[PDB]
Each structure stands twice: as C-alpha cells, then as structure tokens.
C-alpha cells in the first residue's frame, strides 16, 4: 500500500494570502495523483487530476505541481471559502490511498480561552449519575491541553471532549470537556479541577469546586 | 448534469448487514465502473472498490475484504454497497465515478450515506441545568451557563436558548457517541443579567416527539 502523508493537519493561512499544502507519496506513483477539497457535511470535490491539472469549473487560484514522491497543492490568493480540507490521493497502483487530509484555518490575535467548570445537577444527582462539565470557549490557536484533577491526581477515565471547528465570525475554537463519573464515585470524592494549557498564559489557566463547598 | 443519488442514512444494529444505493443519471450508466469510499473521522478517507455494470464484477481493496461485497444493477443505472459484518463501520459512504477516460481521479461523488451501528433504541434525552456554583453569578462582568444533554438516540437533537432569543456568546457542541448520545451548550451573559433576566434552554429530539426547557437557576 502506497502511503500518502500530508504532514500538516492544519495550516494557518490568510484571506487574499498564498498557502501550499504538501503531500508525499510513499513511493513514486508518477504523475496519477489527485487533490480534492471538501466542506462540513459535504462529498469531496475534485480540484486537480494527474498531478497538476485544473478539473474543469475549477478556479485558476488552484494549482498543483510535483510528480514522483513529492506534491505540492497551491492556492495564490486564499479567498473565504477556501478554509477547508483538501486531501491528497493517489491512482497509480491499488489499493486507491488518500492522504490524511490538510484542513485550512484563519490566522488570528491570539485568545484566552474562557474556563468555565460546573458541579454535577441534582437532577442528575437523583438519577445516580454525576457529569462535571468545564467550557473553554474562545481560545486561539486550537493547541490546547485539558487535564482534570479530583483531589490533586489526574483522571483520564470518563473524560469526554467535543469541540467546534474554527468559528466562521471571530475565527477562534471552542471545547467542551466533560467527566462523567456515578454519583457513587463522584461522592468519594471533594476536589474537582479543569485545568487548560495554553500559550496565552504561563500558568494553565485553572477551575475547580469543592463538593458542598460554596 | 452527471448525476449520483446515494440512499438516506440508515441506523443498523451491531451485528447484521445494510445494502446501500447509488442512482446514477445523466450519462450511460455502464460506461463507467462505480467506485465506492469510506470515511471516518479518525482515519480519513479509504477507498473501497470499483464495479463495471457493463460486467468486469469487481475488485476490492485489500482491508474491506469481504465486508465489502460490491454489487450492481442495469436497467436501473444503481449501485449497490452491501456492508456485511458492521460493528466499527459507522461512517459515512460515498458513490464515486472517474470523469475523463484516462485518469482514476474521482470527479463525481454522490452526497454520502451516513451509517450509524448501534444496539441501543430510540431514547429520549435527559437535560440537566448548568449554573455557577453557589448560585451567584460569576466574579466578572460576564457570566456563562450551561445545558447538558445525555442519554438519547439517535441523533439528533436541537437546542435553543430563550426560545432562539438568545443567540450570542452561544457555543453549542457536537454530539459523542456513549450508548446515548451526548451533547452540551454554553451562553455567556452580562453578569447583571442572570439571574435577573431569566434563561433556559429548549431541547428537542425529534425521534422520541420530546421537548425539554430547563430554566437555569441560582443553586447550592
């Protein structure tokens, strides 16, 4: 199986800026190589074929290059619609491989998350469940780090994240991260923390609560 | 106007098998083999296989052995994925075509199938309010509350604040599987405001006909 290896998940672009995405190929697959681009929700769409050439309807700020291991995809003046994920594939010899995928982003000022942490309902209390939710809206760039704390050690175990993509208005990303423990092992426990690592601080930014406690 | 129809999303059980459709249109259907792809949030895109309705049958990708069976059928210009063991192949699928004669690319793709394998049934969500601790309101100008919805199926479920009133500083975030699915929303407020000015969330799952509008409240 031919690899094709797209070493960045996301590039941080501009609008009316360049950009190029960079796939390579495992081995030499010649010129059969394709690039296509796809939007949320949306099948993908075939930009270039045969390593560089424009698929009809296709604008001429799309461009492609390379042929043998190394290909490049261009874009000579980012346009709004053009943040979105472009894959690499090839079709010199099956099995078809697709690259992982290069996702285009915004460049912006960078943002704080806002961190917010919340004690389990008693709704939920009463249903013997217990979620502990911490919000981090806001933050760019997306690096970010999540840990959660219950008296002092780090838990893992019932941690579940989500996250939006990059907010088409303010260009930043947002999360959501929740641990969902039994009211039983919730009830063992006093000290829950959110702590969220991001370059805009030198000292993660932190949320806790004690249970019971004010 | 090449044209391909995929079929509606369907909800399998972890265990049997779903055959899906792809309606071709606007060329002659047996000119062309329809090729078929997968895709998964974690590992992108794979393709599948190829299938001749001229009758060249198959050849499918070493990985999808045969939990992939391709079939087709003239006289009706469709192609069919029958998906056999299904457990971990929750996914969407493409139908996919090559446009020019001499290249592999993929120029047409039909609109994907969403493909959800699950052994749980239809199941209402439950919503729980999210305030800060203590009631209050924060300590800053700005206060955020919360909603979370766990414990339905299938997706989805929509969610508003204020009836829609509320639309600003909202971050509501997408679903993760958990044998019911799960999913939360954040509103962020002038601190003066709540609890002053009231504010609840309205949930809605379509599939269980239920509504739920949990008003958020101060809280010990």
């Known amino acids: 199986d031919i690899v094709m290896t797209q070493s960045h998940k996301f590039m941080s672009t501009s609008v009316g800026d360049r950009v190029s995405i960079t796939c390579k190929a495992s081995?030499?697959?010649?010129?059969?190589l394709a690039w296509y681009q796809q939007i949320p929700g949306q099948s993908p769409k075939l930009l270039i074929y045969?390593?560089?050439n424009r698929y009809t309807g296709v604008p001429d700020r799309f461009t492609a290059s390379g042929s043998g291991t190394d290909f490049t995809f261009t874009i000579s003046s980012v346009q709004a619609e053009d943040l979105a994920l472009y894959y690499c594939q090839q079709h010199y010899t099956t099995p078809w491989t697709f690259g992982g995928g290069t996702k285009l982003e915004i460049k912006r000022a960078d943002a704080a998350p806002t961190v917010s942490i919340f004690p389990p309902s008693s709704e939920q209390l009463t249903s013997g469940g217990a979620s502990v939710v911490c919000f981090l809206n806001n933050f760019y760039p997306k690096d970010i780090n999540v840990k959660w704390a219950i008296d002092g050690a780090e838990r893992a175990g019932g941690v579940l994240n989500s996250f939006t993509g990059q907010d088409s208005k303010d260009s930043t990303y947002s999360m959501s991260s929740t641990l969902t423990l039994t009211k039983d092992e919730y009830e063992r426990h006093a000290s829950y923390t959110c702590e969220a690592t991001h370059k805009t601080s030198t000292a993660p930014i932190v949320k806790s609560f004690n249970r019971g406690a004010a | 106007a090449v044209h391909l129809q995929g079929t509606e999303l369907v909800k399998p059980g972890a265990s049997a098998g779903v055959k899906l459709s792809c309606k071709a249109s606007?060329?002659?259907?047996?000119?062309?083999?329809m090729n078929w792809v997968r895709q998964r949030p974690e590992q992108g895109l794979e393709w599948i296989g190829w299938?001749?309705?001229?009758?060249?049958?198959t050849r499918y990708n070493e990985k999808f052995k045969g939990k992939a069976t391709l079939t087709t059928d003239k006289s009706s210009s469709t192609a069919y994925q029958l998906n056999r063991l299904t457990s971990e192949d929750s996914a969407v699928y493409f139908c996919?075509?090559?446009?020019?004669?001499?290249?592999?690319?993929?120029?047409?793709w039909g609109q994907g199938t969403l493909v959800t394998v699950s052994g749980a049934k239809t199941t209402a969500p439950s919503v729980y309010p999210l305030a800060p601790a203590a009631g209050a309101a924060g300590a800053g100008s700005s206060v955020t509350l919360g909603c979370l919805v766990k414990g339905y199926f299938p997706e989805p479920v929509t969610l508003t604040w204020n009836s829609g009133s509320l639309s600003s500083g909202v971050h509501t975030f997408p679903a993760v599987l958990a044998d019911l699915y799960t999913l939360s929303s954040s509103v962020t407020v002038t601190s003066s405001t709540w609890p002053a000015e009231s504010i609840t969330c309205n949930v809605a799952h379509p599939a269980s006909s239920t509504k739920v509008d949990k008003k958020i409240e101060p809280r010990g």
């Open positions: 081995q030499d697959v010649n010129t059969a």
């Open positions: 996919a075509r090559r446009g020019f004669h001499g290249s592999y690319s993929f120029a047409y």
């Open positions: 299938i001749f309705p001229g009758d060249g049958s």
């Open positions: 606007g060329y002659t259907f047996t000119n062309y083999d």
């Open positions: 045969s390593a560089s």
